[PDB]
Design goal:
Helices cover about 40% and strands about 5% of the residues. The protein has about 120 residues and is mostly helical. A two-stranded antiparallel sheet has the order 1-2. It binds calcium ion (CA). It comes from Oryza sativa subsp. japonica (Rice).
Length: about 120
């Protein structure tokens, strides 16, 4: 793994509310937790409702042997995303609705991929 070159719990993590590549799924960084291989430092409070959904998911994957295809983790995220509301963080350069839909797309695909691998195994 590329992460084996690096390099702790309170390191390699975010303490700041990002809003970068709002519509590009592989590069998206939103809040402290929303984004692939992008997560907040231990104890860091999420930046809004959407970021809070991603925080739960990130921890869910971590506590299930890094299984990013875990169906529970992914289905719970879908449910959370559909119910996102309230103020977002000051200085958020992303559209909440648009970014949530971009994430939802990836997670729908993750749910299917997980289900496929279990229906065979
Ligand atoms: Ca993340």
């Amino acid at each position: 793994n590329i992460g084996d070159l690096l390099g702790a719990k309170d390191q390699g993590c975010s303490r700041t509310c990002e809003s970068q590549f709002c519509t590009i799924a592989p590069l998206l960084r939103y809040g402290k937790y929303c984004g692939i291989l992008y997560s907040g430092c231990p104890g860091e409070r999420p930046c809004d409702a959407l970021d809070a959904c991603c925080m739960v998911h990130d921890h869910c994957v971590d506590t299930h042997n890094d299984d990013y295809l875990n169906t529970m983790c992914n289905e719970n995220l879908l449910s959370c995303i559909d119910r996102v509301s309230g103020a977002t963080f000051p200085g958020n350069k992303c559209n909440v609705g648009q970014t949530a839909s971009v994430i939802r797309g990836v997670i729908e695909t993750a749910v299917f991929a997980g289900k496929i691998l279990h229906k065979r195994d």
